[PDB]
Design a protein around this ligand. Sequence first.
Ligand SMILES: Cc1cc(-c2ccc(C(F)(F)F)cn2)[nH]c1C(=O)N[C@@H](CN)c1ncc(CO)s1
Lengths: 412, 556
Amino acid sequence: IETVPVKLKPGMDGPKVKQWPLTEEKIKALVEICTEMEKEGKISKIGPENPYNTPVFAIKKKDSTKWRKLVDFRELNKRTQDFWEVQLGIPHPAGLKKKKSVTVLDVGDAYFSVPLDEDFRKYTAFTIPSINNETPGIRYQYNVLPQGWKGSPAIFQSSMTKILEPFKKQNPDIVIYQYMDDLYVGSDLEIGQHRTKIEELRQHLLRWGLTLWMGYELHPDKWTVQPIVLPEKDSWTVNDIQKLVGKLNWASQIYPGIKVRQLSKLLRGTKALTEVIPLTEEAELELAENREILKEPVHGVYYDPSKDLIAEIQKQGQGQWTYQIYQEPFKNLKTGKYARMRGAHTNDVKQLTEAVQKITTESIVIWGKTPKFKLPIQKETWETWWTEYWQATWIPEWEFVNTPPLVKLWYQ
Amino acid sequence: MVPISPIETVPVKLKPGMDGPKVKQWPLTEEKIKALVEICTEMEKEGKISKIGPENPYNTPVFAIKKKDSTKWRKLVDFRELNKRTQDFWEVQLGIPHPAGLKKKKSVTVLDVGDAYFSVPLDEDFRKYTAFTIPSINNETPGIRYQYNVLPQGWKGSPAIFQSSMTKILEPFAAQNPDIVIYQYMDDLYVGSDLEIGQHRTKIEELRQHLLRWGLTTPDKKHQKEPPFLWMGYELHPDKWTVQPIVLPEKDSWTVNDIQKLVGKLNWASQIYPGIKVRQLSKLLRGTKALTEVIPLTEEAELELAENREILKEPVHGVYYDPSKDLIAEIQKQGQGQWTYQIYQEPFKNLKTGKYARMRGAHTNDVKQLTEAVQKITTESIVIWGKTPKFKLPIQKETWETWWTEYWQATWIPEWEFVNTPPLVKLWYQLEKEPIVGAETFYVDGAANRETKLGKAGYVTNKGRQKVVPLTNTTNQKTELQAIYLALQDSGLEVNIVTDSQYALGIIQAQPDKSESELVNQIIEQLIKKEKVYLAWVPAHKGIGGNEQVDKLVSA
Ligand SMILES: Cc1cc(-c2ccc(C(F)(F)F)cn2)[nH]c1C(=O)N[C@@H](CN)c1ncc(CO)s1
């Protein structure tokens, strides 16, 4: 019930981020939420002698219609000490990526029962904004551990190990990983029966609140990394072979052996784009060898936890989105594609926002880290709208792509 | 005596790793010293300052300026050196309230607190650094030493500590008087209500009672003003608001100052006067960096300032916000990357207006600019009214649908409807997704010499049509574009074009309708004329049949 000592790393002041404008209903929701939090002691009002600020806004999580407070702690997380005093943080379970089903449990509410270092509280300051700068902003700071702070799981991890030590006691089958305010629970178990030992964990969580009601069911073994595929046709146009030669040339940066000398010789001469050309036998062989080359994985592609993970996303149309995660260009550690059906049958930005959330989740499962995104969208459009569809308690970094990449063709 | 409630003290420290201020007290003339001994004596007997001994090593200089047209000397301490050392305070003074955001209250009373910041206690652990010295006559005694007991004017923390304290005091009064509104911005406190003027000035009195409970004295006899007011360059009337009437300066050889005082002043007018354009006046500025330089008006400038003038001739007014009515925002394209907008709730009566200038880009199109303006208006509206307005846009619904569905980037505008007020924003060309059967296939290429800057651009087609043009003073990138321009210029209404220029692809796939480059705009002009254009890319120096034979031809 006593504080654990927390610092920032020297040479770094606390965060001083400006609060961005909020709709009236979001401000109202935050006022109600923070008034209660103030009553419960989780937060307290703050004077102007606190120069620090972290932005805040309000959401509606998946399948729930009452507002939830989210604090963008991205800048504070950068400036927060890295917690390797007793333990070197939580080592990522390489087995969590390998389970046939994994489910995510919001454990963030458990942080609100443990106090935060009274010396550190001044750095968690946030501002409920006013409309039209009419009245000053309502300023609060955290007394308890805050959701979204990278220190909250680090501090709680010692006291969370005891909460699961009975559960992983009975189930050495089950990998449990925690990231920010989330508990990721995984097993090689059957689908109906994986739901069963979960809800058990739900109640085993209520027993210790004496001294968080729904689930997201990922399947990290229901899918895998995506190969480069070449078309299979019986008659090829000049255009077809041109596109084929282009993608082969592009893939030859990744795979060593992709030959296009036999295929490009077909393209010699200035034929109409829609004219069929029979495939030379050596051209047919060359494409066959290129196929076999494209079926093996890339050789010597390793994950390095010292470097950033980069995620690129291409909009492909009709609700489909492609993506690749890598650390060095052309050495993807994962690729995939986004489907549809999830809102925005007419809102590109909601799709991209949901796509960013799913890729971050898969990235948390595989490496225990979030990637830096390269978003195919103008900064001004993204910035204006992404918070109105955001539902996760974490937030990744992102930059904006302003030049249309030729690679969109090749991942289609 | 009715007892005063104490105002809670804001703890203050100076910046980490900084000492206090130690600056020497200027030599003052004998009359000026006499004035400040007078002032500090009453302020000391008022509890606002107090003499300090020789222990305090800190010192801030103090001067005395004389009140104009009046024989009242008053005091000035230059806190600049202590301001540099004081901690940073929090910055809620991020914006200035916009008149269009105020809701029309029937009675509104504004009370200035230019007095109360001095009745608020200063943190006593910090009073030691507010020390100043009144130099004695003939420097023959130690200057009398003083320190502040309350928020000093000109000090960094005074405005933030004053407003924080004031808000603390106003909370329960506003909470237990929901039938009013209290806004607090800088030294003033705005109070409005929808009750009869009788019960207004009663509750106004009640608030002044409430601030006496903390020892904060309030304007009474007249003093507190009721609409209209000249405030922050606006004119706030009971039913209406508008820019303070401010008229254009006139010169014959306009300097940099001349319109640095006129675009920033026509920017001001553009928030209520519809259709104010600034571009042909600002090109004259960013291209120079001398605060004195003159340069004549361009041929399109005095046509625009003549249009400007035709707008600043009659007073146009803005309405106050009604939260029960819908917010509407309407945009008009005005040309040369200029966009104008009006935000309103019923026709003919704007809440506010404004304009948006395109971003400094190399290429652009109308749809991207309209999108950017929608985002600007969206954020402005959330700032001012706390909600997103419904848009009326000069773009057809099907135009927007083909655009966003085929644009490589993700994009979105919120709820909006088409308004048929030309010039309508259009899609000027659309590339094909698959090759056009029956259309001639133009294999284009270009190449230049990095040393002579000479080069060639041309094409070979499937019907045997060929062309290679020699070019001077060009680069590889220019020739690649020129080759495409030639294919477009020489082909029928439908044409397939094959290139290896990733540079050209990048420009065209971005779909610009206007460019800085003379050559891109020609290509754009050629694309508009076409019926169907399929643009196919191949990698260079693979000798592909068509883009092997023409590569050779342009480097020969
Ligand atoms: C009579 C009056 C009402 C107001 C007001 C109206 C609305 C709001 C709010 F809260 F609604 F935004 C806040 N204050 N200001 C004034 C006013 O005359 N202020 C004078 C000094 N007292 C000056 N302002 C700038 C000066 C030199 O730059 S001198």
